[PDB]
């Protein structure tokens, strides 16, 4: 059952980047912790739903993660309700990053790897300062 079988959060190497709680506030990078199956869905109706600026999809271990940026900002808990409310079964966690760059990096580094991303090329610390 989900208790047993379902993590609880990000993979800890993670957590650090990310926000913890009151979503009261609006941000623009957002990351989904999920299934193989669903985050392959999701990249598709995450990039449709929000025009994503970027999405990047990687694996972790035997699940996905999702790495997005927003055009314009969102609350958390309106994108968590949209992703959770689109497939029914298994386990999904939802957050904001607060570490937009150390986020993605980290997340194309073991034990991450990118399946699949938005732009050819990726992203770079470069693209995360302000345009020249």
Do not use: W
């Not at 979503?23 to 912790?33: E, G, H, Q, V, W």
């Not at 497939?87 to 194309?108: D, P, R, W």
């Amino acid at each position: 059952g989900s208790k047993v079988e379902d993590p609880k959060d990000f993979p800890s190497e993670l957590l650090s980047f990310l926000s913890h709680a009151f979503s009261n506030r609006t941000l623009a990078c957002f990351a989904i912790y999920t299934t193989k199956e669903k985050a392959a869905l999701l990249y598709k109706k995450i990039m449709e739903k929000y025009s994503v600026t970027f999405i990047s999809r990687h694996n972790s271990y035997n699940h996905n993660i999702l790495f997005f940026l927003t055009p314009h900002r969102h609350r958390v808990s309106a994108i968590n309700n949209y992703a959770q409310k689109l497939c029914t079964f298994s386990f999904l966690i939802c957050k904001g990053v607060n570490k937009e760059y150390l986020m993605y990096s980290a997340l194309t580094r073991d034990p991450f790897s990118v399946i699949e991303e938005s732009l050819p090329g990726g992203l770079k610390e470069h693209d995360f300062n302000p345009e020249s």
